[model samples]
Target: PGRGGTETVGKFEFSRKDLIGHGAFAVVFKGRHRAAHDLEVAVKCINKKNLAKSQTLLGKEIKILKELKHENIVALYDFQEMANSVYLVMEYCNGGDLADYLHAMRTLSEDTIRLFLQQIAGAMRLLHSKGIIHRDLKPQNILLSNPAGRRANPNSIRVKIADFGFARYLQSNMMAATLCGSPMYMAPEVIMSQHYDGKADLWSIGTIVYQCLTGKAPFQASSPQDLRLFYEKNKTLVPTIPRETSAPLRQLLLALLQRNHKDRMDFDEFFHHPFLD
Candidate 1:
């Protein structure tokens, strides 16, 4: 919502019932073409104030989203601009987000866990293959489709990797020093500000898989500074692996969460890890 008041976006003009969500940069609303039926879309309206100040960030996100086209990835359907406001019509997911899903279930069965992981890993593979890095891979950014069509559990679950606000295309010798992404999923190399790439996404996936197996994240800290210390000295606080978990699972998590990036596992290693099965 704007400071002055809430704004809206529609097919041809902003409307009331279209409002869906609001963020600092923009507000999202559900809309459709005025003349077309059964063609639903998400309208993201960038506020005038934010658009002027965050042009580069907004442009970068739009460029990445526009260029990307994958089934597991969210699609940018249409684009428009009205004076200071920029609107991106995007694919909509109704299942909400993975965080809410997990919260609702408290936890998932092993089969259900594997199902989601495979989908996530597949999306990651696609991203890495295209040389795009999703700097953020948390549950909140991962959206699910509404459970109501074309499946046993229509709402059973449909996962898609979303939010390119933190993603960027890779270039040779282009390692970023600026620290970004959620601290909980921050990889060791990222915390150190070393030249890193898609592998960081791998580290996040490992952390996620570990979370799926256990109930909480592997890394913990009282503050951001303390979290940095944990990343630098991770071996000291390695959590005890449950005996119920197979040795391979423990080993894979250890490898993925390795403090040293060079020692980390690649996608091939991840696929071979017994934990994946």
Candidate 2:
């Protein structure tokens, strides 16, 4: 699909046999390198048609990835622009999405939940430090590098955050007017269109933590209106998780889930919380 050369532009050689997943924007396939036989990767291909209408998305993705440099963030190995397609080469995650992991186990052990939170919080801290906000942080977008918690090789098994297609850097004193992110994980201020900041992701992390422990979302309203009410008015006393958790974990969740943005724990406070240790 290159302009003049018959040679493929993407680094990883692809095959239909290695198909991994498909989404609205593109198809992902398992890729192999000629030099390293055991090495594998996920190569994403976006049809030219999809790319034609989303230049802003494409620019935003590249810009955010350039700014978000951390071991816990998904590594973008390469990008290719073909005559009819656009391509991205990313790290191979054998554990797939966290949604699949959560589905496989109806409930999570406290250790497992704590590990996931620690890894993502580290990524969040890094993003905020660089002035980037990951507007979307959900199980579906998070890719697990390994199933085992090996610390030797950075990509072996520890959780790493992925998918920067929706992220953007927030300039000082500037907040987004357009709302985005999954409804269940959104901060009350975000939903209300009030000025919000990076702390919104903390609320999302709280919901994810609660979901990890309780096997359900904290709010279960049948409609969007009901959901708004639940988030804005009645989220403080929800006891979605019954088992006794560490005091710091509870305190962190409650603080992050606070309806008032001022009440939510910022990245530094959440980063130094005892639960992470």
Candidate 3:
């Protein structure tokens, strides 16, 4: 009854409105519950054509989402699998991603950036506490909640981390040696596929913060070859912060963007950093 004639999964009925988002692996549709009023959702429909390649990763993401319930993290409401598709019902954030928001605003104030980054830091702390590492921590994966689709006010925008396709659980004292994530934000250790932990995510955050403050990425590379050349040529290279950037922010960026993962700020040190104060 709920398969073809009725567009229902479990107790929730689908009111397929429009395409909210789409990626290589999945397509997100905006919908609402049939029984519940005004309960909007994002139905991530995973195409089964590529299921063989993504089954394990998709399953892991679902498992992680099931256990991770935090205000700053994107909520996974429910999920179901069909013969040719996997449906992931998730909380819909109408404000779009941080990248789009930044594009529209051009740049953000330090105070606004602080509030957003602080929320992201809190979510990272929670994820790390639970042994999860968000391998992909780009601005595109960070969501802002602006329900009504109005232009977001940076001061009041809420941050929610999303897109856990590359996220994984790591054992204590163990390292995730996979070479993944967007190259622009990839930590040195990540590029080298060296042993890394949650500190890797910190490096991404630093790059993002730099972009937010200056409208430019710390490492500017257009291609893999460019990235490799930049890394090799600038071995002792340091990210340049403007003279106008505050001292506390300079210190925080330097700490977070350290070439060596061990030198990068961990959760406790990061949370207590003066820049956040």
For each candidate in turn, the TM-score is: 0.82, 0.85, 0.90
Candidates 1 and 2 compared: the better one by lDDT is 2
Candidate 2: clashing pairs of residues: none
How accurate locally is residue 272 in candidate 3, as Cα lDDT from 0 to 100?
84
By lDDT, is 1 or 3 better? 3
lDDT of 1 by residue, 144-174 (tens): 8855666457336768888677788887357
Among the numbered candidates, top lDDT falls to 3
| Lowest summed lDDT window (length 10), candidate 2 | 1-10
lDDT per residue, candidate 3, 85-130, as tens digits? 5677888886788888777787777788888888988898899899
* Per-candidate RMSD, Å: 3.6, 4.2, 3.2
Model 3 Cα RMSD, 1 decimal? 3.2
Best-to-worst order by lDDT is 3, 2, 1
User: Which one wins by lDDT: 2 or 3?
Assistant: 3
